[PDB]
Design a protein around this ligand. Structure first.
Ligand SMILES: [Cl-]
Ligand SMILES: [Cl-]
Ligand code: NI
Ligand code: NI
Ligand code: NI
Ligand code: NI
Ligand code: NI
Lengths: 142, 145
């Protein structure tokens, strides 16, 4: 039956957010175990991180198979072309609005190094958008 | 000025939202790459994978500023300065997931008529309980020597 508008739709989205964060967090923590000489702990973090990849991807499977949109962009992700279109939408939001706004707030709050980081990221997501736009032209053009 | 205190600022909130978006971007792009793989688009798959490495760098940089600025883990609101604190944050998130989040998700899925999704959430609840237990076992090592 149709997932659209249900609480289960929203729970799949929030599950995807948390699983995405868990993989990132655990791989960041593993770097600290690496440098301090705890290979067993780093290995466990990396193996559990693969678990959280499987969890995130399974959430996306139900989302996609249920006709729901991308948690990050609210765009469909059924076909490869739609996937690339979702990538373009998010990169475009990030470089045109999100990261420039974050940089302005950081400057105005007295954090110039954080602002410089956000400006580096804005330029980076702009490059991403351009590379994905070239892929979209290849796919849509055949 | 890497250690400037960020508590209470709008910048603190923006670092957290940045981390959330970068975390999702890496997962999304690796999931999309699998579709490119199946369909025979290795150049698209490779670009997705390389850009996904960029988003890993972005996410980790946000975590650097969060930690240096005196802020907590975006996922758990626990400090993540030391390795012990990092593992404690992992345990806290896993515990929330298996005691509350995924059981509740599973109950709602059953109530709305989505038994296959409910089964998946129940599998994940048991999985995060195992995660919490494996993490608790290594914390006992750090804290005992
Ligand atoms: Cl170890
Ligand atoms: Cl290709
Ligand atoms: Ni998980
Ligand atoms: Ni990007
Ligand atoms: Ni400094
Ligand atoms: Ni990024
Ligand atoms: Ni887990």
């Amino acid at each position: 039956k149709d997932l659209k508008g249900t609480k289960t739709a929203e729970n799949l989205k929030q599950g995807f957010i948390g699983e995405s964060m868990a993989n990132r967090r655990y791989l960041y923590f593993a770097k600290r175990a690496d440098e301090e000489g705890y290979p067993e702990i780093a290995g466990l973090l990396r193996s559990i991180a693969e678990g959280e990849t499987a969890h995130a991807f399974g959430h996306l499977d139900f989302i996609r198979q249920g006709g729901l949109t991308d948690p990050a962009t609210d765009k469909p992700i059924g076909t490869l072309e739609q996937m690339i279109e979702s990538a373009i939408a998010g990169e475009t939001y990030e470089w045109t609005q999100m990261y420039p706004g974050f940089a302005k707030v950081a400057r105005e709050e007295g954090f110039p190094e954080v602002a410089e980081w956000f400006e580096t990221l804005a330029r980076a997501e702009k490059s991403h958008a351009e590379k994905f736009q070239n892929v979209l032209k290849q796919l849509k053009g055949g």
